[PDB]
Every structure is written in structure tokens, then in C-alpha cells.
């Protein structure tokens, strides 16, 4: 299948009580393998997955150096952005950055991302061609012009198209057992009676990886929606995910409805009927 | 500033068998800003050892966290999640349903 | 691998 590597940076400014908090997390597919906390005693890039721990001490020293340098960047960004919007010093503001790379099943480059956020809104983002910028408002336009002249997009474009893809491939091979695996969901169905006249049917999918899955409700072979409830996919806490779908059915009509599951772990889309 | 109120999902790591070891999970998502208070309660009493995941965010810039602890489900006992946020006028409590 | 280039807004 298609794999991706993404880095998420969050920097929040605390006016008064110290410096800004900086959190960095790295994901390959839906697995987190690295983290950095500005308030952590280690003050180093720590491993969160077993397959990354087998890296040499040279790797960690380099990764620790760059994440700390990026942390200093966003603290300056917070001050610069506060000037841009004429905002008061007393307020606490958040800056977030996300960049990532996509590879296809063939393991070659597919897509790239570079996006910036201030106070929960899009600020400046790199287009999919990796050569143009989108500016949200006037304040974003000031940063766009500087970045266009300095050829920042070209330096970034080199990283996603080349540097990430090489390291993403390296990460996949090093943890082939952990992240190149596919776990089929463990499906079952439950019955809940709201009242004498209508009952609730629950479709469960559990212990599956990757997180992406599709759950559909069909009545008599007809797609059933708007009468159904769907929850956000949840992490089980052991590297597997969970999701469930529910539909309200009148009594005696339970056998009409069917649950259809589509996941990469399943060679055939599963069908669940209450009987 | 944009503010998003958190979504809470309380569940278990494994299917809830009574009298057996399991993990209790609280999944908060769809919230902004990052400052959030999440506690796991047993019969209204705070649980001492509660871990959580590293701060990350979704495509819409919203933050998500997973709080978990080991527990044994019992017919007698009740469990819940207490989440406090700036968007919440009062701390929101969501009780644990083994059927959800 | 973390981004090797540094930028400022």
C-alpha cells in the first residue's frame, strides 16, 4: 500500500511563566516513532517505537540538534507573528507546523505537504506542485514574498521529493515487522433495545491496523445513512485501532440490515447480518 | 483565535470482561487550543497513575490525546472521564459504557 | 529524518 511520513510541531507561548512549550512528534503511517518535549528532563529526541531504537548514537545526536534548532525558530515566529497582527503581549498564542511526504505502493514519491498555522487558522501553505505558496490573509502575504525571493520552496521541495523518500524507505525496511504488517479487524455485532418498538444494532471493528477503514450500513441491499451513528476511529492503546457503527431498526426488521467492512487486512469485504 | 470544543470517547483497550485486567481509555480530539485537563475517575475518585500520549494534531490543526490506565472492570464499579477545557463552561464528565 | 533547513516567518 501507500505509506507516508509526517512531522508535527506545536509551539505555545506562555506570557510570563517562562519560555514557549515546544512539542515535536513524528509519524510513519499511523505509528509514532519519535518525540521531543521542551519541558522534558532528557532535553533530547526520544524514541517511541522499538524499530527506531536500533539507530546509532550518531543519528540521535543529529536529530536532537535539528529539533532544538527548529524549536528556536518557532519561538522567533511567535514574536514575529505577534507584531504582524498587532497583538498584545499578554495573550498566549499557538503556532503549528506540518510537513510530510507520500509514496505509492511502488514506494516512489507521490505527494508533499508544507503548512503553517497560527492560533488555529491556516497561515501559509505550499501547493502540491511544491513550487507555489498560498497566503491566507495580508499578514501571510508579507511572509510569502520573503519566502518566494529566498527560494525556500525549492530547498523544501528537495527534502520532500528526495530526502524524506529515502528515509521513509529506510524506516519501512528497519521496521518491516511493525509497520508493513496489516491487521484485519475483529468484527462482531451487538443488540440494544431502546423500547418495545425499535432496537439499536451495533457494528464493531477492533484490533486493526492501519487506522483507515470504511463501515457501511445497508438495508435490503440499499445504502443506509442519516439514520446511523458513526464514531471517530479510536486508538486501542496497543498499536491497534477501533471503530463502530450503529443503526436504529424497528423490531422484527433486524434481519433486513447488513454491515459491510472494507479494510486492507481483509482480502474480501466482510458482511455482517444479525441472525 | 479559533476554538474547537473537544470530543470525548471513553472505552476499553479490550472487550470488557468482568474481573479481568484491562486498560481504560479516554480519547479527546477535535479541540483547540492545546491546554486541556483530562482525569480518569473510579466512582468519582481520581486514579493516581494515568499516562497519556504525546501531543499531536489532525489535518484541521485540531489537537488529540489518549489517556489510559490499567483497571479491572467490575459489576459494582463505575468509571468515567473528566475533561475540562476553556471552551467548556463546566467540566464535562462522560461515563464509561462497555457497550460503546 | 527531521528537516535539515531552517526558516523564519
Numbering used by the authors:
A (entry chain I): 1 to 275
B (entry chain i): 1 to 100
C (entry chain Y): 1 to 9
Study text:
We next determined the crystal structure of the HLA-A2/YVL-BR complex in order to identify specific structural features that might be associated with the dominant AV8.1-KDTDKL-AJ34 usage in the YVL-BR-specific TCRs. Structure determination was complicated initially by the relatively low resolution and high degree of translational pseudosymmetry that characterized the HLA-A2/YVL-BR crystals, but ultimately clear and continuous electron density extending the full length of the peptide allowed confident location of all peptide atoms. In the HLA-A2 complex, the nonameric YVL-BR peptide is bound in conventional orientation, with the amino terminus and side chains of Val(V) at position 2 and Val(V) at position 9 accommodated in pockets (A, B, and F, respectively) in the peptide binding site. Notably, the side chains of Tyr(Y) at position 1, highly negative charged Asp(D) at position 4, and His(H) at position 5 project away from the binding site, and compose a highly featured surface positioned for recognition by CDRα loops of a TCR bound in conventional orientation. By contrast, the side chains of Leu(L) at position 6, Ile(I) at position 7, and Val(V) at position 8, together with exposed main-chain atoms, present a rather non-descript generally hydrophobic surface positioned to interact with CDRβ loops of a TCR bound in conventional orientation. Our structural analysis revealed that the MHC-bound YVL-BR bulged at position 4, in a region of the peptide that TCRα would have to accommodate, exposing a negatively charged Asp(D). We cloned a TCR expressing the dominant public TCRα chain AV8.1-KDTDKL-AJ34 and using mutagenesis, we provided evidence indicating that the positively charged Lys(K) residue in the CDR3α of the public TCRα chain was important for YVL-BR/MHC recognition.
Generation and maintenance of virus-specific CD8 T cells is dependent on specific interaction between MHC-peptide complexes on the infected cell and the TCR.
